[PDB]
Design an enzyme around this catalytic site. Structure first.
Site, PDB file in Angstrom:
ATOM      1  N   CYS A 128       0.842  -1.181   0.000  1.00  0.00           N
ATOM      2  CA  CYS A 128       0.000   0.000   0.000  1.00  0.00           C
ATOM      3  C   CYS A 128       0.883   1.240   0.000  1.00  0.00           C
ATOM      4  CB  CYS A 128      -0.916  -0.004   1.227  1.00  0.00           C
ATOM      5  SG  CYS A 128      -2.041   1.379   1.356  1.00  0.00           S
ATOM      6  N   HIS A 158      -5.142  -7.979   4.442  1.00  0.00           N
ATOM      7  CA  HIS A 158      -4.714  -6.947   5.385  1.00  0.00           C
ATOM      8  C   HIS A 158      -4.430  -7.525   6.768  1.00  0.00           C
ATOM      9  CE1 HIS A 158      -6.512  -3.853   2.638  1.00  0.00           C
ATOM     10  NE2 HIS A 158      -7.353  -4.845   2.396  1.00  0.00           N
TER      11      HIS A 158
END
Ligand SMILES: O[C@@H]1C[C@@H]2[C@@H]3C[C@H](O)[C@H]4[C@@H]3C[C@@H]2[C@H]41
Length: 147
Positions: free
Chosen positions: A97, A141
Protein backbone atom coordinates in the site's frame (compact mmCIF):
# COMPACT_ATOMS: atom_id res chain seq x y z
CA UNK A 1 -21.52 -13.92 26.97
CA UNK A 2 -18.62 -12.49 24.95
CA UNK A 3 -18.42 -9.13 23.16
CA UNK A 4 -20.35 -9.86 19.92
CA UNK A 5 -18.12 -11.16 17.14
CA UNK A 6 -16.38 -13.55 19.56
CA UNK A 7 -16.86 -17.30 19.92
CA UNK A 8 -15.22 -19.95 22.05
CA UNK A 9 -13.03 -22.41 20.16
CA UNK A 10 -10.78 -25.37 20.87
CA UNK A 11 -7.14 -25.68 19.87
CA UNK A 12 -6.75 -28.72 17.62
CA UNK A 13 -3.13 -29.16 18.62
CA UNK A 14 -3.32 -28.44 22.38
CA UNK A 15 -6.94 -28.88 23.44
CA UNK A 16 -7.01 -25.51 25.23
CA UNK A 17 -9.99 -23.26 24.74
CA UNK A 18 -9.33 -20.03 22.87
CA UNK A 19 -11.45 -17.23 21.50
CA UNK A 20 -11.91 -16.27 17.87
CA UNK A 21 -13.45 -13.13 16.40
CA UNK A 22 -15.14 -13.69 13.05
CA UNK A 23 -15.19 -9.98 12.15
CA UNK A 24 -11.50 -9.29 12.77
CA UNK A 25 -10.19 -12.87 12.37
CA UNK A 26 -8.30 -12.28 15.61
CA UNK A 27 -7.65 -15.21 17.91
CA UNK A 28 -6.40 -15.15 21.49
CA UNK A 29 -6.17 -17.35 24.59
CA UNK A 30 -7.77 -14.99 27.14
CA UNK A 31 -11.50 -14.34 27.35
CA UNK A 32 -11.96 -11.06 25.45
CA UNK A 33 -12.46 -7.86 27.45
CA UNK A 34 -16.22 -7.24 27.38
CA UNK A 35 -18.92 2.29 19.07
CA UNK A 36 -16.97 5.48 18.27
CA UNK A 37 -17.67 7.85 15.42
CA UNK A 38 -14.14 7.34 14.09
CA UNK A 39 -11.21 4.99 14.53
CA UNK A 40 -7.60 5.31 13.46
CA UNK A 41 -5.87 2.30 11.95
CA UNK A 42 -2.65 1.22 10.37
CA UNK A 43 -2.48 -1.72 8.03
CA UNK A 44 -0.09 -4.04 6.21
CA UNK A 45 -1.49 -5.06 2.84
CA UNK A 46 -0.29 -8.02 0.82
CA UNK A 47 -1.69 -7.96 -2.68
CA UNK A 48 -2.17 -10.93 -4.98
CA UNK A 49 -2.84 -11.49 -8.67
CA UNK A 50 -6.61 -11.06 -8.17
CA UNK A 51 -6.24 -7.75 -6.35
CA UNK A 52 -8.33 -4.96 -7.84
CA UNK A 53 -5.01 -3.35 -8.85
CA UNK A 54 -2.25 -5.99 -8.93
CA UNK A 55 0.59 -3.51 -8.64
CA UNK A 56 2.29 -1.62 -5.84
CA UNK A 57 5.33 0.47 -5.04
CA UNK A 58 7.11 -2.85 -4.30
CA UNK A 59 6.24 -4.60 -7.58
CA UNK A 60 4.97 -3.26 -10.90
CA UNK A 61 3.21 -6.57 -11.61
CA UNK A 62 1.99 -8.49 -8.57
CA UNK A 63 1.76 -12.16 -9.51
CA UNK A 64 1.66 -14.05 -6.20
CA UNK A 65 -1.45 -16.11 -5.61
CA UNK A 66 -4.00 -15.34 -2.94
CA UNK A 67 -2.80 -18.45 -1.09
CA UNK A 68 0.78 -17.16 -1.25
CA UNK A 69 -0.35 -13.75 0.02
CA UNK A 70 -2.15 -15.38 2.94
CA UNK A 71 1.01 -17.30 3.86
CA UNK A 72 2.98 -14.06 3.82
CA UNK A 73 0.33 -12.40 6.00
CA UNK A 74 0.32 -15.34 8.40
CA UNK A 75 4.09 -15.12 8.69
CA UNK A 76 4.04 -11.41 9.45
CA UNK A 77 1.37 -11.98 12.10
CA UNK A 78 3.59 -14.62 13.74
CA UNK A 79 6.63 -12.35 13.86
CA UNK A 80 4.56 -9.44 15.18
CA UNK A 81 2.96 -11.57 17.89
CA UNK A 82 6.30 -13.04 18.95
CA UNK A 83 7.89 -9.60 19.16
CA UNK A 84 10.57 -10.62 16.66
CA UNK A 85 9.31 -7.75 14.48
CA UNK A 86 7.19 -4.64 14.95
CA UNK A 87 4.02 -4.09 12.96
CA UNK A 88 5.22 -0.65 11.83
CA UNK A 89 8.52 -2.07 10.59
CA UNK A 90 6.90 -4.85 8.58
CA UNK A 91 4.34 -2.43 7.14
CA UNK A 92 7.09 -0.03 6.05
CA UNK A 93 9.04 -2.81 4.38
CA UNK A 94 6.40 -5.09 2.96
CA UNK A 95 2.98 -3.45 2.70
CA UNK A 96 1.78 -3.23 -0.91
CA UNK A 97 0.00 0.00 0.00
CA UNK A 98 1.09 3.61 -0.48
CA UNK A 99 0.62 3.90 3.27
CA UNK A 100 3.75 1.78 3.81
CA UNK A 101 5.74 5.03 3.72
CA UNK A 102 3.77 6.17 6.80
CA UNK A 103 4.38 2.90 8.69
CA UNK A 104 0.97 1.74 7.49
CA UNK A 105 -0.99 4.59 9.10
CA UNK A 106 -4.25 5.45 7.30
CA UNK A 107 -5.32 8.15 9.73
CA UNK A 108 -8.78 8.38 11.21
CA UNK A 109 -11.95 7.43 9.37
CA UNK A 110 -15.69 6.85 9.75
CA UNK A 111 -18.01 4.12 8.62
CA UNK A 112 -18.69 4.30 4.89
CA UNK A 113 -15.21 5.31 3.72
CA UNK A 114 -13.26 2.03 3.64
CA UNK A 115 -13.97 -1.29 1.99
CA UNK A 116 -16.57 -3.02 4.10
CA UNK A 117 -14.55 -5.97 5.52
CA UNK A 118 -11.80 -3.55 6.48
CA UNK A 119 -14.27 -1.13 8.05
CA UNK A 120 -15.98 -3.87 10.04
CA UNK A 121 -12.70 -5.28 11.33
CA UNK A 122 -11.38 -1.83 12.22
CA UNK A 123 -14.45 -0.91 14.25
CA UNK A 124 -14.61 -4.31 15.98
CA UNK A 125 -10.98 -4.07 17.11
CA UNK A 126 -10.29 -2.70 20.53
CA UNK A 127 -7.85 0.20 20.77
CA UNK A 128 -4.37 -1.26 20.39
CA UNK A 129 -5.69 -4.58 19.00
CA UNK A 130 -4.50 -6.30 15.81
CA UNK A 131 -6.66 -8.18 13.36
CA UNK A 132 -6.04 -11.53 11.76
CA UNK A 133 -6.02 -11.72 7.96
CA UNK A 134 -8.80 -9.51 6.60
CA UNK A 135 -9.82 -9.94 2.97
CA UNK A 136 -10.88 -7.11 0.65
CA UNK A 137 -10.76 -6.48 -3.08
CA UNK A 138 -7.34 -4.91 -2.51
CA UNK A 139 -5.77 -8.01 -1.05
CA UNK A 140 -5.16 -9.34 2.45
CA UNK A 141 -4.71 -6.95 5.38
CA UNK A 142 -3.32 -6.97 8.87
CA UNK A 143 -5.12 -4.14 10.68
CA UNK A 144 -3.83 -2.36 13.79
CA UNK A 145 -6.33 -0.09 15.52
CA UNK A 146 -4.34 2.76 17.03
CA UNK A 147 -7.17 5.05 18.19
O1 LIG B 1 -7.79 -20.76 -0.99
C1 LIG B 1 -7.51 -19.89 0.11
C2 LIG B 1 -7.17 -18.45 -0.33
C3 LIG B 1 -8.01 -17.58 0.61
C4 LIG B 1 -9.45 -17.23 0.16
C5 LIG B 1 -9.89 -17.82 -1.19
C6 LIG B 1 -10.55 -19.15 -0.81
O2 LIG B 1 -10.25 -20.21 -1.73
C7 LIG B 1 -10.13 -19.41 0.65
C8 LIG B 1 -10.33 -17.96 1.19
C9 LIG B 1 -9.52 -17.93 2.49
C10 LIG B 1 -8.24 -18.46 1.85
C11 LIG B 1 -8.68 -19.75 1.10
Amino acid sequence: KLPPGWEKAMSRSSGRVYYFNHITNASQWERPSGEPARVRCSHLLVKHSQSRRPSSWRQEKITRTKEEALELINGYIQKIKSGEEDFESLASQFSDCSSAKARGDLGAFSRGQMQKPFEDASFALRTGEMSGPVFTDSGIHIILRTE
